[PDB]
């Protein structure tokens, strides 16, 4: 109807909650919607939001003791609580009012429902707009871009490190009905608090947004509406540098001169087991690069984070997701206030766009591997001061191929055919590393399909191909059949009969994973085992083959043992071992590891004593949107919409997830009114 449906114009403030605890927040103006949003978030996730906001204040240690102390030291040394005050002071008046409203929403819920807030996090109250800013700043710059694990060279815990996503946007020309399609599909921890997605709907007379965001964030990162929608995937935009300092004469050597550290003398409180606290002094040293950390091995490392002068992250996302046109979206994107992420855009006018987004330092020399390692901190040659504008970054708009995609692969095949190559960009922007089997599968699923309907688009999202099996079994099986061990022969035949799909009933899939663990490493990303290595000239059909079939058969022998150790048998049905268990809901699993090729992702834990494992990471918020008039959208949230103790909205979608039975996402007032179970009238 090339003119959108009449926008709903709310006349009172109310949250209409549906049966799954999805809040439909109707506000008479923007602060009202943000207030209801905070209120809703607090109701569904209050305890963890408070804890996180506590942490963002640099008060984790003070509130909860030694387990929170590393983050405290990290955030204080990096001046995060103070930077938050600054960024908060630096908001536009309008947006600050929204942030304040959001916080007031949280406080108000807590004030009206004090017994619903967990006793341990009551002390955090009240919260403020600055806390909201701090949390978002922590999340973006000091979890995503820089983290203490990386700076300390200890590595990040899985809670943080397991990050991924799928993203598809399909142009009209590639669809049946002529409307852009969009897949929102982030893959984060199912347990990590700051990575908990919350689904919501905000309606004012001026804007409408539907979708998911991490708890405690006041704006929706995976948002769509009647006009447009976006989705994100992590791109590991190298937005920070760790510098190895040479310590000398009480300072650090730099361009042959001894330079002084800048020193604040801070201190923080540390909660004791008995509930009292001790004051711990904290000296914060900064070189010209940034704050200085000392590794366990005694290396002095200065961490330099890009975009510390970018306070408009939350407002950028807000203006992006409420954009009236693609030009507006881009103008907002072009502010470079969002420090990281691939961002994919689709709208009802038919535009699709992929952007390798973030705040990337301009560097005179060095490739991406150089800039991800310890960079020498004794030379001004390595001190960047400038960042790339949007226009310097890999982007694709309405490509000839009619789609854009990203599955955390380097941005070198975001569409097919490609519209640029690695040499078109500085070598430090993105790795030129092999694309994962899931990423190759993403390109294939879009490129190879035409005349897409929403239903078909949704079916394709469910892909759970063992691509790794396609690349290896042709060589492994014949070689395994040579082996005299009848068990190895039996294993080979089990593997040969398998359709190479990670279905619940697959008796071969677990064994295969175990072999793959050895063949391609614990993360299934190793390349040394393949006969034909990955090539950007065959980006979706390499790597391929088994380089050393003898050794691979030895790996199968060990794998057979591992499978039996873990699962009690080499032929246990995949979905008997792989379970999705939330509260007392226990449903069969399907799909699996992305690195094995599964597009739909469940990163199955190690099994327990019964051989049972559950997703530690993977499908969380999944939504497919057709930009028809009106839009049509379906979605699910694996672990429900609430994690508050005792909620009925934690385990209430996982059964549907197991059957790929998506909910209709309800954006229209009439639909919302039809689905409403709870109403929270409010007044901001």
XYZ file of C-alpha atoms in Angstrom:
684
model
C 0.000 0.000 0.000
C 3.124 2.216 -0.393
C 1.997 4.336 2.626
C 2.277 2.905 6.202
C -0.615 1.963 8.504
C -2.074 4.689 10.746
C 0.264 5.000 13.744
C -1.381 4.399 17.112
C -1.448 7.534 19.260
C -1.685 6.638 22.981
C -3.845 8.750 25.228
C -2.835 7.208 28.529
C 0.275 5.532 29.968
C -0.115 1.802 30.298
C 1.807 -1.406 29.896
C -0.149 -4.174 28.261
C 1.547 -7.471 29.122
C 0.887 -10.499 26.988
C 0.862 -14.149 28.056
C 4.637 -14.463 27.727
C 5.404 -11.396 29.817
C 6.154 -9.173 26.848
C 5.457 -5.589 27.914
C 3.697 -3.350 25.435
C 4.555 0.027 26.786
C 2.268 2.817 25.629
C 3.282 6.299 26.602
C 1.669 9.666 25.895
C 5.215 10.955 25.212
C 8.819 9.722 25.115
C 9.768 9.991 28.809
C 6.575 8.062 29.592
C 7.510 5.172 27.323
C 11.052 5.098 28.765
C 9.597 5.150 32.278
C 7.285 2.231 31.488
C 10.247 0.533 29.838
C 12.360 0.822 32.995
C 9.431 -0.276 35.122
C 8.888 -3.328 32.872
C 12.597 -4.203 32.776
C 12.741 -3.957 36.557
C 9.713 -6.196 36.890
C 11.182 -8.832 34.583
C 14.890 -8.481 35.413
C 15.197 -6.072 38.339
C 17.604 -8.079 40.471
C 20.209 -8.514 37.762
C 19.793 -4.982 36.386
C 20.396 -3.567 39.854
C 23.472 -5.789 40.304
C 24.831 -4.698 36.931
C 24.169 -1.006 37.650
C 25.871 -1.575 41.002
C 28.865 -2.930 39.102
C 28.888 -0.058 36.590
C 29.241 2.329 39.562
C 32.506 0.614 40.348
C 30.842 -0.690 43.497
C 30.633 -4.406 42.754
C 33.382 -5.097 45.274
C 31.772 -2.815 47.851
C 28.390 -4.473 47.454
C 29.257 -8.132 46.887
C 32.905 -8.724 47.713
C 35.904 -10.441 46.129
C 34.069 -12.011 43.160
C 33.260 -8.519 41.918
C 36.648 -7.006 42.698
C 38.375 -7.581 39.345
C 35.614 -5.719 37.497
C 35.693 -2.971 40.120
C 39.440 -2.504 39.673
C 38.956 -2.664 35.889
C 36.185 -0.075 35.806
C 37.775 2.299 38.293
C 41.179 2.122 36.640
C 39.462 2.884 33.316
C 37.504 5.771 34.878
C 34.152 4.266 33.861
C 31.953 5.565 36.680
C 33.383 9.082 36.160
C 33.201 8.861 32.355
C 29.554 7.927 32.839
C 28.855 11.099 34.824
C 30.488 13.019 31.943
C 28.609 11.222 29.167
C 25.413 11.669 31.138
C 26.139 15.405 31.530
C 26.817 15.424 27.765
C 23.464 14.014 26.641
C 21.043 16.230 24.775
C 18.376 17.569 27.184
C 15.633 15.479 25.519
C 17.513 12.234 25.636
C 18.679 12.794 29.230
C 14.986 13.165 30.167
C 14.457 9.722 28.617
C 17.370 8.198 30.513
C 16.064 9.773 33.764
C 12.576 8.488 33.075
C 13.958 5.004 32.481
C 15.777 5.050 35.821
C 12.712 6.490 37.573
C 10.772 3.562 36.095
C 13.219 1.141 37.722
C 13.073 2.965 41.085
C 9.294 3.194 40.985
C 8.853 -0.520 40.367
C 11.259 -1.214 43.258
C 9.484 1.286 45.487
C 6.013 -0.202 44.733
C 7.311 -3.768 44.951
C 10.116 -3.726 47.516
C 9.700 -7.384 48.427
C 10.239 -8.385 44.785
C 13.729 -6.997 44.725
C 16.335 -9.487 45.916
C 17.761 -8.458 49.348
C 21.393 -8.419 48.114
C 20.746 -5.699 45.490
C 18.377 -3.439 47.454
C 21.406 -1.364 48.485
C 21.941 -0.295 44.849
C 18.698 1.698 44.865
C 17.885 4.337 43.865
C 19.385 4.266 40.368
C 19.908 7.274 38.078
C 20.298 8.218 34.436
C 24.053 8.176 34.980
C 23.885 4.514 36.111
C 22.061 3.692 32.873
C 24.801 5.559 30.956
C 27.497 3.789 33.003
C 26.100 0.343 32.412
C 25.832 0.953 28.648
C 29.345 2.399 28.622
C 30.617 -0.603 30.556
C 28.865 -3.036 28.242
C 30.052 -1.444 24.968
C 33.543 -0.196 25.752
C 34.634 -2.359 28.695
C 33.060 -5.702 27.951
C 32.694 -5.783 24.150
C 35.598 -3.623 22.988
C 38.033 -3.989 25.882
C 37.847 -6.447 28.773
C 40.112 -7.163 31.707
C 40.719 -10.748 30.566
C 42.198 -9.509 27.283
C 44.180 -6.624 28.767
C 45.528 -8.898 31.532
C 46.318 -11.566 28.914
C 44.348 -14.120 30.916
C 41.624 -14.386 28.294
C 37.918 -13.767 28.774
C 35.680 -16.220 30.608
C 33.069 -17.989 28.377
C 30.426 -15.751 30.032
C 31.919 -12.943 27.958
C 33.889 -14.628 25.135
C 31.076 -16.702 23.560
C 29.632 -14.124 21.204
C 28.040 -14.452 17.828
C 24.996 -13.818 15.716
C 23.347 -14.352 12.405
C 21.930 -11.508 10.362
C 20.020 -11.566 7.114
C 18.409 -8.836 5.157
C 16.700 -9.663 1.873
C 15.751 -7.066 -0.742
C 12.259 -7.027 -2.390
C 13.569 -8.447 -5.683
C 14.575 -11.624 -3.895
C 11.201 -12.122 -2.177
C 7.814 -13.472 -3.317
C 5.715 -10.453 -2.252
C 8.220 -7.661 -2.846
C 8.979 -6.793 0.804
C 12.336 -6.736 2.585
C 12.933 -9.554 5.096
C 15.005 -9.266 8.255
C 16.505 -11.743 10.644
C 17.432 -10.726 14.187
C 19.524 -13.553 15.636
C 22.120 -12.739 18.369
C 24.097 -15.581 19.990
C 25.093 -14.883 23.562
C 25.281 -16.725 26.845
C 22.064 -18.095 28.268
C 23.392 -17.317 31.764
C 25.467 -14.127 31.589
C 23.373 -11.330 33.124
C 24.533 -8.364 31.030
C 23.898 -10.491 27.906
C 20.304 -11.316 28.883
C 17.934 -10.196 26.101
C 14.572 -8.701 26.944
C 11.753 -8.350 24.455
C 9.565 -5.234 24.548
C 7.357 -2.870 22.561
C 7.338 0.902 22.984
C 4.622 3.106 21.522
C 4.272 6.850 21.755
C 2.349 9.154 19.446
C 5.766 9.885 17.817
C 7.514 6.551 17.541
C 7.157 2.842 17.738
C 9.829 0.225 18.315
C 9.551 -3.503 18.903
C 12.242 -5.981 19.876
C 15.058 -7.145 22.108
C 17.878 -5.478 23.979
C 20.260 -6.481 26.770
C 18.680 -5.969 30.196
C 19.471 -2.550 31.678
C 19.777 -0.919 28.237
C 17.097 1.714 27.732
C 17.014 1.444 23.935
C 16.225 -1.571 21.793
C 19.214 -2.870 19.850
C 17.293 -5.485 17.854
C 14.411 -3.299 16.814
C 11.871 -3.132 14.059
C 8.621 -1.335 13.484
C 6.107 -0.689 10.702
C 8.772 1.127 8.683
C 12.238 -0.319 9.274
C 14.321 -2.626 11.386
C 17.899 -3.371 12.354
C 19.950 -6.195 13.741
C 23.468 -6.521 15.112
C 26.275 -9.039 15.085
C 29.665 -8.795 16.808
C 32.505 -7.935 14.410
C 35.349 -7.655 16.945
C 36.015 -4.114 15.741
C 39.519 -3.640 17.188
C 38.642 -0.537 19.155
C 41.312 -0.800 21.839
C 45.067 -1.326 21.969
C 47.095 -3.027 24.698
C 50.565 -1.492 24.880
C 53.562 -3.182 26.462
C 55.270 -0.470 28.494
C 58.968 -0.416 29.259
C 59.145 0.661 32.889
C 62.105 2.834 33.812
C 63.252 5.512 36.287
C 59.820 5.544 37.931
C 58.010 6.188 34.620
C 57.905 4.533 31.204
C 60.292 4.801 28.261
C 58.696 6.552 25.251
C 60.524 7.904 22.160
C 63.758 7.378 24.158
C 62.540 9.625 26.999
C 61.291 8.617 30.443
C 57.690 9.749 30.674
C 55.752 10.291 33.888
C 52.646 8.280 34.700
C 49.583 10.352 35.555
C 48.401 9.145 39.037
C 45.056 9.481 40.775
C 45.017 7.906 44.249
C 41.658 6.205 44.423
C 40.239 3.662 46.854
C 37.184 1.412 46.952
C 35.410 -0.665 49.569
C 35.518 -4.472 49.606
C 32.589 -6.373 51.171
C 33.781 -9.018 53.654
C 32.212 -12.440 54.288
C 30.744 -11.052 57.533
C 29.053 -8.205 55.598
C 31.400 -5.435 56.737
C 33.799 -3.735 54.339
C 37.483 -2.866 54.170
C 38.970 0.139 52.339
C 41.405 -0.915 49.639
C 43.566 1.789 48.115
C 43.800 1.851 44.331
C 46.514 3.747 42.526
C 45.429 4.558 38.986
C 48.386 5.096 36.648
C 48.016 6.289 33.085
C 50.637 6.573 30.364
C 50.002 8.663 27.239
C 48.161 5.574 25.895
C 45.756 5.091 28.820
C 45.343 3.319 32.194
C 48.050 0.907 33.219
C 47.557 -2.672 34.322
C 50.095 -5.164 35.565
C 49.892 -8.731 34.354
C 50.520 -11.781 36.533
C 53.785 -12.188 34.589
C 54.740 -8.602 35.536
C 54.175 -6.956 32.134
C 52.967 -3.373 32.421
C 50.157 -2.899 29.929
C 48.505 0.419 29.052
C 45.076 0.006 27.489
C 43.950 2.586 24.953
C 40.244 2.542 24.224
C 38.806 4.323 21.209
C 35.652 6.412 21.420
C 35.989 7.613 25.010
C 34.646 10.912 23.636
C 31.468 9.314 22.240
C 28.638 9.831 24.736
C 25.783 9.439 22.258
C 25.687 5.615 21.904
C 22.187 5.201 23.371
C 20.817 8.168 21.419
C 22.380 6.948 18.182
C 20.643 3.575 18.490
C 17.435 5.368 19.401
C 17.632 7.643 16.352
C 18.669 4.752 14.148
C 15.766 2.584 15.219
C 13.229 5.410 14.907
C 14.562 6.729 11.582
C 11.951 8.010 9.085
C 14.068 7.092 6.080
C 17.233 5.257 5.157
C 19.074 8.613 4.787
C 18.120 9.408 8.422
C 19.251 5.983 9.582
C 22.645 6.507 7.916
C 23.051 10.034 9.221
C 22.531 8.614 12.722
C 24.838 5.652 12.048
C 27.446 8.120 10.743
C 27.801 9.761 14.192
C 30.161 6.914 15.099
C 28.839 6.742 18.663
C 28.292 2.982 18.529
C 31.786 1.615 19.100
C 31.356 -1.809 17.551
C 29.054 -4.293 15.715
C 28.038 -5.206 12.243
C 24.679 -3.526 11.778
C 22.148 -4.686 9.217
C 19.159 -2.603 8.124
C 15.963 -3.302 6.157
C 12.875 -1.142 5.582
C 9.475 -1.087 3.971
C 10.733 1.080 1.099
C 12.915 -1.859 0.107
C 16.388 -0.700 1.217
C 18.746 -3.193 2.783
C 22.149 -2.302 4.199
C 25.093 -3.947 5.892
C 27.604 -1.916 7.861
C 30.820 -3.045 9.465
C 30.342 -0.521 12.221
C 32.387 0.821 15.090
C 35.066 3.210 16.228
C 38.243 2.180 14.429
C 41.557 3.984 15.053
C 43.418 5.227 11.944
C 46.824 3.592 11.913
C 49.833 4.320 9.712
C 51.146 0.725 9.866
C 50.483 -2.854 11.045
C 47.799 -5.404 10.152
C 45.011 -6.571 12.434
C 47.094 -9.287 14.159
C 49.672 -6.668 15.133
C 47.002 -4.405 16.606
C 45.303 -7.211 18.549
C 48.559 -8.208 20.302
C 50.748 -6.274 22.701
C 51.810 -3.226 20.732
C 55.076 -1.578 21.764
C 54.325 1.230 24.253
C 57.717 2.916 23.875
C 57.037 4.796 20.657
C 54.752 7.567 19.402
C 54.685 5.716 16.058
C 51.997 3.491 17.539
C 49.913 6.153 19.274
C 46.784 6.631 17.196
C 44.618 9.669 17.831
C 42.136 9.517 14.947
C 39.249 7.256 13.998
C 37.647 6.217 10.723
C 34.403 7.886 9.587
C 31.528 5.547 8.547
C 32.559 6.040 4.879
C 35.926 4.337 5.448
C 34.188 1.211 6.697
C 32.967 -1.830 4.720
C 29.323 -1.179 3.767
C 26.881 -2.674 1.312
C 23.585 -1.089 0.261
C 21.014 -2.749 -2.071
C 23.648 -5.111 -3.512
C 23.142 -6.773 -6.923
C 22.727 -10.087 -5.063
C 19.555 -8.847 -3.296
C 20.682 -9.691 0.215
C 23.165 -8.904 2.938
C 24.326 -11.278 5.677
C 26.703 -11.561 8.536
C 27.429 -14.449 10.810
C 30.515 -13.019 12.600
C 32.627 -13.797 9.522
C 35.090 -11.132 8.423
C 33.119 -8.658 6.248
C 34.494 -10.047 2.943
C 31.386 -11.884 1.769
C 28.489 -9.793 3.221
C 26.667 -10.331 -0.038
C 27.074 -12.415 -3.161
C 28.548 -11.344 -5.513
C 30.874 -9.234 -3.370
C 30.964 -5.481 -3.881
C 34.490 -4.996 -2.501
C 37.560 -7.020 -1.467
C 39.995 -6.910 1.529
C 42.516 -4.684 -0.321
C 39.850 -1.960 -0.504
C 40.328 -1.278 3.218
C 43.186 -0.918 5.714
C 44.436 -4.375 6.741
C 43.822 -3.625 10.414
C 40.015 -3.214 10.030
C 39.107 -6.880 9.895
C 40.840 -10.244 9.957
C 41.320 -12.082 6.699
C 40.829 -15.388 8.526
C 38.772 -18.363 7.205
C 34.993 -17.923 7.391
C 33.290 -20.384 9.722
C 31.092 -23.108 8.334
C 28.035 -21.315 9.722
C 29.084 -18.101 7.937
C 29.558 -19.986 4.660
C 26.184 -21.597 5.211
C 24.585 -18.148 5.720
C 25.850 -16.899 2.325
C 24.631 -20.093 0.676
C 21.176 -20.061 2.279
C 20.523 -16.549 0.989
C 22.278 -16.639 -2.371
C 20.886 -20.019 -3.382
C 17.278 -19.116 -2.691
C 14.950 -16.892 -4.626
C 11.342 -15.742 -4.398
C 11.519 -15.967 -0.604
C 8.371 -15.901 1.505
C 8.471 -15.156 5.218
C 7.676 -18.824 5.963
C 10.520 -20.014 3.759
C 12.875 -17.363 5.245
C 11.927 -18.696 8.702
C 12.540 -22.331 7.609
C 15.975 -21.425 6.297
C 16.820 -19.860 9.653
C 16.411 -23.340 11.150
C 19.279 -24.795 9.108
C 21.330 -27.142 11.208
C 23.594 -28.780 8.657
C 26.752 -30.512 9.782
C 28.765 -28.749 7.050
C 31.915 -29.985 8.718
C 30.606 -33.513 8.021
C 30.120 -32.647 4.307
C 33.746 -31.492 4.181
C 35.283 -34.439 6.041
C 33.166 -37.592 5.948
C 33.792 -38.199 2.202
C 37.472 -38.803 3.146
C 37.085 -40.012 6.753
C 34.632 -42.816 6.196
C 36.483 -44.928 3.568
C 39.643 -44.480 5.683
C 37.857 -45.534 8.848
C 36.534 -48.637 7.139
C 40.137 -49.756 6.560
C 40.636 -49.988 10.343
C 40.324 -53.491 11.895
C 38.511 -52.354 15.066
C 34.853 -53.386 14.518
C 33.832 -50.442 16.669
C 35.583 -47.992 14.329
C 33.877 -49.730 11.410
C 30.508 -49.568 13.161
C 31.155 -45.878 13.878
C 32.017 -45.196 10.251
C 28.765 -46.840 9.108
C 26.729 -44.904 11.636
C 28.373 -41.728 10.339
C 27.853 -42.810 6.703
C 24.136 -43.407 7.146
C 23.628 -39.980 8.805
C 21.905 -37.221 6.772
C 24.390 -34.816 8.362
C 21.672 -32.784 10.024
C 21.685 -32.024 13.726
C 18.179 -33.342 14.361
C 16.924 -34.694 17.699
C 16.794 -38.223 16.329
C 20.324 -38.239 14.914
C 22.199 -41.151 16.409
C 25.411 -40.078 14.643
C 25.725 -36.405 15.524
C 27.343 -36.661 18.992
C 30.018 -39.066 17.800
C 30.729 -36.684 14.920
C 31.138 -33.685 17.236
C 33.647 -35.631 19.301
C 35.647 -36.501 16.254
C 35.462 -32.886 15.120
C 36.755 -31.728 18.539
C 39.950 -33.619 17.898
C 40.052 -32.971 14.128
C 39.392 -29.221 14.302
C 40.090 -28.445 18.001
C 37.743 -27.799 20.947
C 36.207 -24.749 19.184
C 35.973 -26.655 15.834
C 37.893 -23.829 14.146
C 41.282 -25.443 13.460
C 42.411 -25.677 9.831
C 45.498 -27.906 9.960
C 43.422 -31.065 9.486
C 41.915 -30.164 6.101
C 43.342 -31.272 2.766
C 42.281 -28.073 0.973
C 42.592 -24.917 3.072
C 40.200 -21.969 3.173
C 40.310 -19.589 0.244
C 38.501 -16.314 -0.275
C 38.258 -17.390 -3.933
C 36.029 -20.312 -2.850
C 34.675 -18.776 0.304
C 31.743 -21.150 0.873
C 33.237 -24.463 -0.278
C 36.577 -24.456 1.549
C 38.250 -25.696 3.676
C 37.659 -29.246 2.476
C 38.997 -32.783 2.766
C 40.980 -34.749 5.324
C 44.714 -34.019 4.954
C 45.905 -37.091 6.845
C 43.257 -39.843 6.858
C 45.378 -42.246 8.965
C 45.665 -39.654 11.769
C 42.015 -38.712 11.361
C 41.066 -42.371 11.876
C 43.163 -42.397 15.055
C 41.214 -39.303 16.049
C 38.026 -41.265 15.391
C 39.213 -44.044 17.688
C 39.770 -41.527 20.514
C 36.458 -39.851 19.616
C 34.578 -43.159 19.951
C 36.005 -43.372 23.497
C 35.120 -39.742 24.291
C 31.575 -40.165 22.957
C 31.086 -43.219 25.203
C 32.617 -41.450 28.183
C 30.290 -38.482 27.667
C 27.107 -40.127 26.442
C 27.272 -43.816 27.390
C 27.113 -44.955 23.740
C 28.330 -43.928 20.263
C 24.761 -43.846 18.951
C 22.727 -41.991 21.545
C 19.979 -39.867 19.917
C 21.247 -36.269 19.667
C 18.155 -34.777 21.341
C 18.189 -37.327 24.170
C 21.568 -36.012 25.291
C 21.075 -32.457 23.997
C 18.289 -31.005 26.110
C 16.845 -27.586 26.731
C 15.946 -27.524 30.375
C 14.601 -24.436 32.068
C 13.000 -24.858 35.477
C 10.942 -28.054 35.162
C 10.581 -27.811 31.364
C 12.740 -30.409 29.615
C 12.523 -30.544 25.844
C 14.546 -32.248 23.090
C 17.330 -30.193 21.476
C 18.218 -29.876 17.791
C 20.800 -27.828 15.861
C 24.259 -27.304 17.337
C 27.676 -25.758 17.051
C 28.039 -22.916 14.573
C 31.608 -23.843 13.791
C 30.335 -27.246 12.666
C 28.072 -25.431 10.195
C 24.774 -25.233 12.099
C 23.205 -21.915 11.167
C 20.712 -22.080 14.014
C 23.051 -22.259 17.004
C 23.023 -24.097 20.306
C 26.414 -24.210 21.929
C 25.842 -27.353 23.953
C 27.593 -27.590 27.332
C 29.677 -30.552 28.393
C 27.300 -33.342 29.471
C 26.639 -34.197 33.114
C 26.636 -37.641 34.742
C 23.570 -38.655 32.704
C 25.135 -37.525 29.460
C 22.768 -34.572 29.418
C 23.901 -31.217 28.126
C 22.113 -27.907 27.558
C 22.851 -24.740 25.581
C 25.371 -22.451 27.306
C 25.014 -20.052 24.370
C 23.268 -19.687 20.993
C 19.726 -18.873 19.884
C 18.333 -16.311 22.296
C 16.189 -13.679 20.661
C 15.166 -14.822 17.200
C 12.865 -12.749 15.015
C 12.076 -12.744 11.318
C 10.317 -9.640 9.967
C 8.565 -9.079 6.649
C 8.246 -5.394 5.824
C 4.808 -5.750 4.279
C 2.048 -3.265 5.103
C 1.353 -3.936 7.882
C 4.572 -5.713 8.877
C 4.472 -9.380 9.772
C 6.925 -10.664 12.306
C 7.594 -13.826 14.230
C 9.927 -14.445 17.122
C 10.988 -16.425 20.165
C 13.202 -15.831 23.169
C 14.828 -19.092 24.321
C 14.961 -18.304 28.058
C 11.745 -16.298 28.185
C 11.210 -12.680 29.071
C 11.963 -12.747 32.772
C 14.611 -14.159 35.046
C 13.261 -12.856 38.349
C 13.070 -15.606 41.003
C 9.788 -17.451 40.690
C 8.706 -15.932 37.339
C 6.395 -17.958 35.102
C 8.138 -16.307 32.109
C 11.497 -18.039 32.161
C 10.689 -21.582 30.920
C 7.530 -20.722 28.998
C 8.990 -20.399 25.466
C 11.619 -23.118 25.421
C 9.072 -25.800 24.483
C 8.052 -23.645 21.519
C 11.750 -23.145 20.679
C 12.143 -26.951 20.562
C 9.333 -27.150 18.020
C 10.379 -23.960 16.123
C 6.883 -22.654 16.838
C 7.368 -18.914 16.645
C 5.005 -16.412 18.277
C 3.428 -13.762 16.163
C 5.018 -10.504 17.236
C 2.158 -8.185 17.988
C 2.726 -4.581 16.976
C -0.860 -3.451 16.202
C -3.067 -2.116 19.030
C -5.929 -4.502 18.139
C -3.592 -7.483 18.332
C -2.092 -6.291 21.603
C -5.575 -5.713 23.069
C -6.501 -9.248 22.018
C -3.429 -10.780 23.674
C -3.278 -8.767 26.910
C -3.149 -10.643 30.237
C -1.849 -7.964 32.559
C -2.198 -4.186 32.551
C 0.020 -1.797 34.430
C -1.571 1.672 34.336
C 1.048 4.236 35.132
C 1.836 7.866 35.541
C 5.205 9.446 34.862
